[PDB]
Amino acid sequence: RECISIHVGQAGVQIGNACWELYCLEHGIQPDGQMPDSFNTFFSETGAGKHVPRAVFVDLEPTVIDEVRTGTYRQLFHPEQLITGKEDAANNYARGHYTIGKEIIDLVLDRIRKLADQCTGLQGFSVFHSFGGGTGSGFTSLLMERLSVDYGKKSKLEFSIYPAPQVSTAVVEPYNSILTTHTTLEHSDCAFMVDNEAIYDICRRNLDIERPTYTNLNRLIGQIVSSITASLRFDGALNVDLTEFQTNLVPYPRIHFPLATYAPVISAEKAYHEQLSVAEITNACFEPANQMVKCDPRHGKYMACCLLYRGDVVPKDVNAAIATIKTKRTIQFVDWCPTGFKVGINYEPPTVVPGGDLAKVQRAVCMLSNTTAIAEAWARLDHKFDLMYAKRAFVHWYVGEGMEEGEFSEAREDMAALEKDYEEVGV
């Protein structure tokens, strides 16, 4: 039925800031308020005009949220769904999860419950946050723990941002990622990882931008997310229910992180070109250069594939495209699991931002796969962490806020385990 979005910390905020804008454009809601159920999934028809989101934005410093209460969309939200916190997260889980968090948790927790109160039978939360990064790791982890206390069943879907050297990280980043992903794991149902290097990469090979901005990256991520939710905003089979999301992608409680691949990304200017064939975009879906987490599944195995189409598309083709997508390709499905392909088509065409860098497209695909090769990213992170921890590199800052040296072991200890589970699923 209903559906709350939570955006915590800079990355979280700004990402949602850009996908709440694609949402509006998709459902035609002029910023201020109304349009001249279906999409009630995400908005609450407030007042006798306005349309307002079911979202909450939290950051531990103003700055980011302040720019939201400034630029148009200023009117779009309620002042109360925008929580801000004066003192910064400092860049270490330990602060966000303990010291600085505690102080703002009770105010957030209560407001998201103020939103869930006008929802006859809520469904769950979609949460957006950074992997490394101050409050993104810290506060998130704490939110989720307590969200599990106040909302027993209700599912939790996280949209995490896996950090990458070039789109500037922070030295301590790997600690933070490992740290959150530990506590946070036994509490999420299914999570969508997004490698910043992958998106930086797509913006280069495709949009052709020498220096990709955040505002450039986010727009693209916006689209992937839109395509992910979509299903449950327009209502029309395949993932029309948060439950049905995990039921289709995660076979194991170990919160599995599906690998997302977006269809045709092509720059305006190239806009008035040729419409890409239904067969072709599917064909571009089984292509590493177009993933969302840098790695490669021609290596590992697949244990649940999903195709989410959008626009002008009849199944008749989607079929013949699948047929030929198997013939001269790396099928490599895993031992005890069908050959999934829960196909979903959502006739509603892919709208894109007006001054954007991508053009309108006749039809687009999404493909959410749960492969074993996604663990190649859990490795890349562990190594960084392991190698720094080999000398207590920056640990003292965390012990400083009040953490145990033990929680560092105990967390990497899980990541050692997960990487084992992942590999263990192979044939």
């Binding site: 700055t63 910064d88 922070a170 030295v171 301590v172 220096r211 003292h396």
Partner: protein
């Protein structure tokens, strides 16, 4: 979010005075008056370094301290003399020192409270206080002795916020006192304990840059400060200017100092004296261009942070910055991943069309501590000029206790050239 600036003792006061008038003209501020300059940015984070008073006026959040009038009235009747808030100056009147003891106990303690209670009014005035930064010399005493005291008293009243210092470590050439090594060692110990980050401006390095590489014969205290002053603007840029980073100064700490023992940074500047990019990097990573008498070669870098300046393409920067830690990829500790971060800002400094500055946490700094500890144990051997301190109330073993702490600092930096 907002920082106060303590500036104490002849050197400190002179050093900072140039800092102030240098950033003030960056932001476009008159001896008193406000803005004037077709730029627009400047003002965003002007907040950070300027509490602003009556009418237009900008007045820096600065406290001025010393134990003898002269040096202060040098500023008042000087560059941007009118800029500072009148009852923000804290005179000493009495004997100076040029002896630590005097400044950290007797003539020092005397003033402390009257200063402490002026930093207290600036701080509590701040909307959200970030921390303090102080400028002073480690040799001599009216700032190396009162200074190390001021800070010991800031933590205690502000455990909370962080402590930042620019400290000029002294040398055998271009020095007024035989005792400097005593004064230096005595502070180094203090710095280690109560500060989060300390920038080392070596005067040996400084003199070397003017004469060894800039045909400047007799190096005044003047063209010498010009170096420190330019470096200091470079080091802070990111917290006073754009909307790229923002710089919590705490974020800067948590990310530059891997190990508690406040690790001391050696700074370096790009073009100099009173520029292709590959040409700029090659220079900013050269010993011949560090602000401390060291030589990163005889030691690995723990973490490095560089900040460029001027209209130039980051495409080139990111490329050249990778090309340094490659032709030199052995000198960047490999147990700390992306340990070298670069920031670019597009508002040129004084003159200069292009500019870069560099902050380095390098175990080669060991070399500097070793050389002051060399003249120390070389004098404290047969207890030298020591009776000058014994007399002001200090104990004999408070010297050994400092020497001992300091050599460990060397024995730790030398421990981290590991694997």
């Amino acid at each position: 979010r907002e920082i106060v600036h303590i500036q104490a003792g002849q050197c400190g006061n002179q050093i900072g005075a140039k800092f102030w008038e240098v950033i003030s003209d960056e932001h476009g501020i008159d001896p008193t008056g406000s803005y004037h300059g077709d730029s627009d940015l400047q003002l965003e984070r002007i907040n950070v370094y300027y509490n602003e008073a009556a009418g237009n006026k900008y007045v820096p959040r600065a406290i001025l301290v010393d134990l003898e009038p002269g040096t202060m009235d040098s500023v008042r009747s000087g560059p941007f003399g009118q800029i500072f808030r009148p009852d923000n100056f804290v005179f000493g009147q009495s004997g100076a020192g040029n002896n630590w003891a005097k400044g950290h106990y007797t003539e020092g303690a005397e003033l402390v409270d009257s200063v402490l209670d002026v930093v207290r009014k600036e701080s509590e005035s701040c909307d959200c206080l970030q921390g303090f930064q102080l400028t002073h010399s480690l040799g001599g005493g009216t700032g190396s002795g009162m200074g190390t005291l001021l800070i010991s008293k800031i933590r205690e009243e502000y455990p909370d916020r962080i402590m930042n210092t620019f400290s000029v470590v002294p040398s055998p050439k271009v020095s007024d006192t035989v005792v400097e090594p005593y004064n230096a060692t005595l502070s180094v110990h203090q710095l280690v304990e109560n500060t989060d980050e300390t920038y080392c401006i070596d005067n040996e390095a400084l003199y070397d840059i003017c004469f060894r590489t800039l045909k400047l014969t007799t190096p005044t205290y003047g063209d010498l400060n010009h170096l420190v002053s330019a470096t200091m603007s470079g080091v802070t840029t990111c917290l006073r200017f754009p909307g790229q980073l923002n710089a919590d100064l705490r974020k800067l700490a948590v990310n530059m100092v891997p190990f508690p023992r406040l690790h001391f940074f050696m700074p370096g500047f790009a073009p100099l004296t009173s520029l292709t990019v590959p040409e700029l990097t090659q220079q900013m990573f050269d010993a011949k261009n560090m602000m401390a008498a060291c030589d990163p070669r005889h030691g690995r870098y723990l973490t490095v942070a560089a900040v460029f300046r001027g209209r130039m393409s980051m495409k080139e920067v990111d490329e050249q910055m990778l090309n340094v830690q490659n032709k030199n990829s052995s000198y960047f500790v490999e147990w700390i991943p992306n340990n070298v971060k670069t920031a670019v800002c597009d508002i040129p400094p004084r003159g200069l069309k292009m500019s870069a500055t560099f902050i380095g946490n390098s175990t080669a700094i060991q070399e500097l501590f070793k050389r002051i500890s060399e003249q120390f144990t070389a004098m404290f051997r047969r207890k030298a000029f020591l009776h000058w301190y014994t007399g002001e109330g200090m104990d004999e073993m408070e010297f050994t206790e400092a020497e001992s702490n300091m050599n460990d600092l060397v024995s730790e930096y030398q421990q981290y050239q590991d694997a």
